Design a protein around this motif. Structure first.
Motif: not given
Ligand SMILES: [Fe+2]
Ligand SMILES: [Fe+2]
Lengths: 196, 195
Positions: A21, A25, A30, A119-120, A159-161, A164-165, A168-169
């Motif tokens: 997944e 994405f 992206h 940050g990213s 980057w969180e993307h 994150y799936i 998460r954090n």
């Protein structure tokens, strides 16, 4: 027109460290999005017929952001693979022993930098301008080529993307898992190019 | 020690525009995490017994990043609410008409800036020193108090964690959904103080 380089592996090849997944994405949304956007922006510019890397080196603003992200993303996918990970081998193994004392020392310091970044951005293993391996962190779309701080050897997207799936954090578990995916063959390719 | 301000509503109160899971992670991990980290960072420093805003203004580095994220997140939660959103009302409706011509002009302009922002950051509605409403964007933990670019009225978090669980890469849909949550009463309170 700029195109999106193929992955060298299937969308599920990094599972379970990075899920199908996430790859879907991250790559098909992206990474593909940066390519589509850059093509839009460089139509009618001096950048329209230049290489991606020439655009990275020469541009700023939105053109740089999209161009560098395309380049950084490709470097990231190539920095990984199935049936990779584990201990380094070949010349990069020697260079890591020389510059960090051990792989485990490098791993701890890299994880510390990646986890502490606010940050990213991107973590890098790079050959600096004194022919020494170093760890760099860049913000947003930044990279060592543009900064003239070194030649990229490997990168990890934070980057969180990127996580994150699946995590998460919990970026620390993403980083822990990423070590099972590192493609040392790509690092050796980059080292050889960097030292020539 | 700095504490985490309570939400004015339940964790499910913004659904389905922002999910309860999102608020759970966003509030109880990220926002609570900034609080815990800041407290460790300012122990045995001059910042130890100062207010969050004082810390935001006077600090730099990791102390700043953490302090400003605490303040920004609180302003974000308070900028939304259940049974809010939709058309503005009261003084802020009138002020938006004056400064942006119409609510739809403002809505579309603000959405473009929120969607256009590269990397982690925040969109702001603020009041400048001429009592004019302005749209501002800041990066990472930045905010208009730190920058002296205006008095905050409303904010929207566009860090990816704000929306990734519900919308993945589709920030536009998150932004659209956010208009259903905008707390115009908070905007009115802030406008009144700011003028
Ligand atoms: Fe990425
Ligand atoms: Fe946030």
């Amino acid at each position: 027109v700029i195109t999106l380089p193929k992955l060298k592996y299937a969308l599920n090849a990094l599972s379970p460290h990075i899920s199908e997944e996430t790859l879907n994405f991250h790559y098909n949304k992206h990474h593909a999005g940066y390519v589509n956007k850059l093509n839009t922006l460089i139509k009618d510019t001096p950048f329209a017929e230049k290489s991606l890397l020439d655009i990275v080196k020469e541009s700023s603003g939105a053109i740089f952001n999209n161009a560098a992200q395309i380049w950084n993303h490709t470097f990231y996918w190539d920095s990984m693979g199935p049936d990779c990970g584990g201990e380094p081998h070949g010349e990069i193994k020697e260079k890591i022993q020389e510059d960090f004392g051990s792989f485990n020392n490098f791993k701890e310091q890299f994880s510390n930098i990646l986890c502490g970044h606010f940050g990213s951005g991107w973590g890098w293993l790079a050959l600096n301008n004194n022919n020494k391996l170093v760890i760099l962190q860049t913000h947003d779309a930044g990279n060592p080529i543009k900064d003239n701080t070194g030649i990229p050897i490997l990168t990890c997207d934070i980057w969180e993307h990127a996580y994150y799936i699946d995590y998460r954090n919990d970026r620390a578990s993403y980083v822990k898992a990423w070590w099972n995916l590192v493609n040392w063959n790509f690092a050796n390719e980059n080292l050889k190019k960097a030292m020539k």
